[PDB]
Scaffold this active site. Structure first.
Site, mmCIF file in Angstrom:
data_model
loop_
_atom_site.group_PDB
_atom_site.id
_atom_site.type_symbol
_atom_site.label_atom_id
_atom_site.label_comp_id
_atom_site.label_asym_id
_atom_site.label_seq_id
_atom_site.Cartn_x
_atom_site.Cartn_y
_atom_site.Cartn_z
ATOM 1 N N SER A 197 0.848 -1.194 0.000
ATOM 2 C CA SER A 197 0.000 0.000 0.000
ATOM 3 C C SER A 197 0.889 1.252 0.000
ATOM 4 O O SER A 197 1.717 1.408 -0.900
ATOM 5 C CB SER A 197 -0.930 -0.003 1.217
ATOM 6 O OG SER A 197 -1.668 1.204 1.314
ATOM 7 N N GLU A 324 -8.851 -5.472 -4.016
ATOM 8 C CA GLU A 324 -8.214 -4.308 -3.418
ATOM 9 C C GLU A 324 -9.180 -3.243 -2.941
ATOM 10 O O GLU A 324 -8.773 -2.341 -2.210
ATOM 11 C CB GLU A 324 -7.266 -3.664 -4.424
ATOM 12 C CG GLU A 324 -6.192 -4.593 -4.931
ATOM 13 C CD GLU A 324 -5.032 -4.712 -3.973
ATOM 14 O OE1 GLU A 324 -5.236 -4.520 -2.757
ATOM 15 O OE2 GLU A 324 -3.914 -5.004 -4.437
ATOM 16 N N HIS A 437 -7.317 -5.969 0.534
ATOM 17 C CA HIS A 437 -6.105 -5.182 0.425
ATOM 18 C C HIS A 437 -5.246 -5.456 1.666
ATOM 19 O O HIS A 437 -5.728 -5.366 2.793
ATOM 20 C CB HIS A 437 -6.490 -3.706 0.376
ATOM 21 C CG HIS A 437 -5.332 -2.769 0.262
ATOM 22 N ND1 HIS A 437 -4.629 -2.595 -0.910
ATOM 23 C CD2 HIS A 437 -4.779 -1.923 1.163
ATOM 24 C CE1 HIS A 437 -3.696 -1.679 -0.728
ATOM 25 N NE2 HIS A 437 -3.766 -1.255 0.521
#
Ligand code: NAG
Ligand code: NAG
Ligand code: NAG
Ligand code: NAG
Ligand code: NAG
Ligand code: NAG
Ligand code: MG
Ligand code: MG
Ligand code: MG
Ligand code: MG
Ligand code: MG
Ligand code: MG
Ligand code: MG
Ligand code: MG
Ligand code: MG
Ligand code: MG
Lengths: 532, 532
Positions: A197, A324, A437
């Site tokens: 991320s 995600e 995610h």
């Protein structure tokens, strides 16, 4: 002693930690910069002044002051991400995991946690470096950096709050590694930075920035990229949010000096409370203080740098997860619940689209909506929900990373792309959320190897397989073990654009990762929004 | 005698023609208006002055002066559409097919040929009304109207060339039917107008125009609609093309009077030769002189009329063919051939897109291209070819008709939609072209019943089935025969939006006819082009 190491900054006292019926050296909480406190809040980091004696590096350091997610109190799903240690502006420390016996000069891997630049810690259980360090005989480092205003408040021009300081805290730790990792048996000439991320973005950003290129060898980017729409802002936007933050705290907005004079007198929590109020639009997958394209750390715009090949040329391994977007929809989009299938009505679906592309004008929202709506069955709840997930996911993570991977491969020395799509058999988040995610992290750090965590054999297999790809890649610049007999993970090429799955089934090679939607996000939509 | 009929304009002498081992009355070439020649070129039509004696209506009338397609000399595929009779400005005649014995007052069907308003004839073999007239015991009429400049040159304001005159020649023939069809055993109160392509559009246009609404009961529209992008032009565009035509023929462009003074002195062929030179853009599925939104024949814009329900409210039956685009690609798009599979390269594909949406700006072309490109396999020749076919088809025929059908059903008294997708076993056009625009006609007129034409039994079945739907619909306003036992063709509703296939397999009900692409063409693209 193996637990005692003398570094250029002073002696450090590690600790022997158990790991899978064996042990390894762990040097936790080593300082690499002066406590960015007081008059130093917002300022660039200063290298840690050498200390006399032996530094006790046996316990974890404090976590940087950050917004703590309390949406789901006591739910391990969310708290696994909250700071598990005391919070403090004095948080610029780094952790190291060295194999035992100490290797002479082995491959090093530096972890840059994610958290959208507003949160994150190096001490989370899911980032425990022992399993990876031990299993793949690598020196694993886990750095830290300031998040939120503390690490990214940007009043470009000012040297009191230049912006990107957090990105600098990273460069410094990476520097300290360059200068000391050799004493721990790690080859400074074989440092592979890898993050997820915001961490992934940060990684790509060190690839980009000239001032970092010589501070690592390779790089792994997970569900994140330098060009992610949320990963940065212009100098103008940055300033606007700084002044806005000020205005939120009855700060004197008359001078860059006393605006900061003011911010520096506010308690950390005071800043955190009004942190999200400076975002331009109501949205999801958007964070207040993030990297700013200052013109120094980032020479020119990220786009121009990528097109001109103005970036470090090495090998890179990266990929994304299948879903995600669900994590963010759950938190900010209407209709989503942790307690139901989250079927989204056409009305919520549209609220979501707008919340997902807050900068798009109505024509844009129409484009997006049209692109993700099945008009033969527009009121299917499952389809809208899955659609929003792809929108958020495609727009914020997958497509930006694909733009990056395509732009990078034209100059790089090797690219390896993956598509993690395995849903953990023990996931605590509801089914609808799929492969969320950040939930590939546990597989990268070997958490499935810990029998207590209640993972399945096949899952232990997948993790061991991933850790090896990552390790082998950090070691050779190629995920594949030489002469090995299993299926090879093909190099991603501009022409073939191959990537592989990452699940408990036999490896499948694929091509053009979501090229259809990414052509929309990377080329069409941008043009529509600039034209109209 | 059965072949002698006295009409309000004079006596007419029909002729007994053989039809499927039997016979029927045929009154061919009956005049319904004064020969629009000389000082009358471009002017509205004048009702035919009654004549003394018996008019010989045993042979076919002349075809209106038109551009004749000679792209494929001697190829029955194309010549089946060229004028099969002498060409002459004196061409406003109508043909009738009456069952024998003459019915007292049966259902009448009036055919309005297509041809993009620039060509067309009432005397083509594929429009032979005997098979339909005989088989479904209906009085079949086949009118005619001026095409090209002759029928549509428009200098709005002028009464010497007001525009839409061709559309008027149609109204007049329809009027003559209203006044005389009773004498032929046809019920003037049960006249169902039906046409294909421009004919379909013309039909929808008589639904729209207040001056025609009382001239028919029902209507059938085939692969054509009043709002088709090629079906009309603004008064400004019309004028521009008239002056452009003038300029092409060294005409005095100083006054609406002498511009026409000039055009009226030019031989028909002289006009035809320079006819296509007045189109705004290089394109396909665009025709020079077509209906103009004058404000008289069309009160307001077609869109406003459709939204306000300002149109005749009755039942309507309509549909399109599967491959409405191939015919036009073959003729004007690069890469297409009558002698190969016509695999289209990415480069030709884009030339086609631009040729298909000549009014779209680059952002639009990008939208279109993106919408019809499979990025996982963008260089597939078969896929590009089939894509262009859908683009041309969706943009020019299917989507405009769907917009129409949706807008109409909210006020109409019944809608029946079909999707013809049967490829004739004897088609002379190459396979790639599929179910070509206009090749459902032969099935509507019963050509498969003619054993010599070499059709298959199942195909004769399909035709007999279609003719019956059309007939039954013209007779009752419902394609379905009462209490009948076969599968019923569901009414098209705003909510269900059901339609049926039309092929040799058991009937399948479907929904939302190509709603995905039509949402693009009917809503998204229009908005993109107006915004940018
Ligand atoms: C610091 O090191 C000492 C031994 O030198 C020991 O008490 C422990 O490992 C560390 N202190 C803490 C915070 O537990
Ligand atoms: C990496 O660089 C080396 C050195 O020039 C070159 O031989 C090799 O082909 C490159 N590998 C890739 C796939 O970029
Ligand atoms: C016109 O009618 C006459 C008989 O009245 C006959 O010669 C024929 O059917 C028609 N003439 C032509 C053009 O053949
Ligand atoms: C047609 O109009 C009649 C008369 O009002 C009405 O009863 C009937 O429901 C209508 N049919 C449809 C389906 O529009
Ligand atoms: C396996 O996983 C749970 C969840 O973390 C953990 O508490 C424990 O080690 C195992 N569950 C039990 C108590 O069986
Ligand atoms: C069947 O069709 C052809 C094509 O129109 C026609 O010429 C003829 O009647 C039949 N073909 C032959 C000569 O067998
Ligand atoms: Mg100050
Ligand atoms: Mg001060
Ligand atoms: Mg999903
Ligand atoms: Mg291994
Ligand atoms: Mg290994
Ligand atoms: Mg004159
Ligand atoms: Mg004159
Ligand atoms: Mg096709
Ligand atoms: Mg029948
Ligand atoms: Mg019948």
């Amino acid at each position: 002693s193996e637990l005692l190491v003398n570094t250029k900054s002073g002696k450090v006292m590690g600790t022997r930690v158990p790991v899978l019926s064996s042990h390894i050296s762990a040097f936790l909480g080593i300082p690499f910069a002066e406590p960015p406190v007081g008059n130093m809040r917002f300022r660039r980091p200063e290298p840690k002044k050498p200390w006399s004696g032996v530094w006790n590096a046996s316990t974890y350091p404090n976590n940087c002051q950050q917004y703590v997610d309390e949406q789901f109190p006591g739910f391990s799903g969310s708290e696994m991400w909250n700071p598990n240690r005391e919070m403090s502006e004095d948080c610029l420390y780094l952790n190291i995991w060295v194999p035992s016996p100490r290797p002479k000069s082995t491959t090093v891997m530096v972890w840059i946690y994610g958290g959208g630049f507003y949160s994150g810690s190096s001490t989370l259980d899911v980032y425990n470096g022992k399993y990876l360090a031990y299993t793949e005989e690598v020196v694993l480092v886990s750095l830290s950096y300031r998040v939120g205003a503390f690490g990214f408040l940007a009043l470009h021009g000012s040297q009191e709050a230049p912006g990107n300081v957090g990105l600098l805290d990273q460069r410094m730790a990476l520097q300290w590694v360059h200068d000391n990792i050799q004493f721990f048996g790690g080859d400074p000439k074989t440092v592979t930075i890898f993050g997820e991320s915001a961490g992934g973005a940060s990684v790509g950003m060190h690839i980009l920035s000239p001032g970092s290129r010589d501070l690592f060898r390779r790089a792994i980017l997970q569900s994140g990229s330098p060009n992610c729409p949320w990963a940065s802002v212009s100098v103008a936007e940055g300033r606007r949010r700084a002044v806005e933050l000020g205005r939120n705290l009855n700060c004197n907005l008359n001078s860059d000096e006393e605006l900061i004079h003011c911010l520096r007198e506010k308690k950390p929590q005071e800043l955190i409370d009004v942190e999200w109020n400076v975002l331009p639009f109501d949205s999801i997958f958007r964070f207040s203080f993030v990297p700013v394209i200052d013109g120094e750390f980032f020479p020119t715009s990220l786009e121009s740098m990528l097109n001109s090949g103005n970036f470090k040329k090495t090998q890179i391994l990266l990929g994304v997860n299948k879903d995600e977007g669900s994590f963010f929809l759950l938190y900010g989009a209407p209709g989503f619940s942790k307690d139901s299938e989250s079927k989204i009505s056409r009305e919520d679906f549209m609220s979501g689209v707008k919340l997902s592309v807050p900068h798009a004008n109505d024509l844009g929202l129409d484009a997006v909506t049209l692109q993700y709506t099945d008009w033969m069955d527009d009121n299917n709840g499952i389809k809208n929900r899955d659609g929003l997930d792809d929108i958020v996911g495609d727009h914020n993570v997958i497509c930006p990373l694909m733009h990056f991977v395509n732009k990078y491969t034209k100059f790089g020395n090797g690219t390896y792309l993956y598509f993690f799509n395995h849903r953990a058999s023990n996931l605590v988040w509801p089914e609808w959320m799929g492969v969320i995610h950040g939930y590939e992290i546990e597989f990268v750090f070997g958490l499935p190897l810990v029998k207590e965590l209640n993972y399945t054999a096949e899952e232990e297999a997948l993790s061991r397989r991933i850790m090896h790809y990552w390790a082998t890649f950090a070691k050779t610049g190629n995920p594949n073990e030489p002469h090995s007999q299993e299926s090879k993970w093909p190099l991603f090429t501009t022409k073939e654009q191959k990537f592989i799955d990452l699940n408990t089934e036999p490896m499948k090679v694929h091509q053009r990762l979501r090229v259809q939607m990414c052509v929309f996000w990377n080329q069409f939509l941008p043009k529509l929004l600039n034209a109209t």
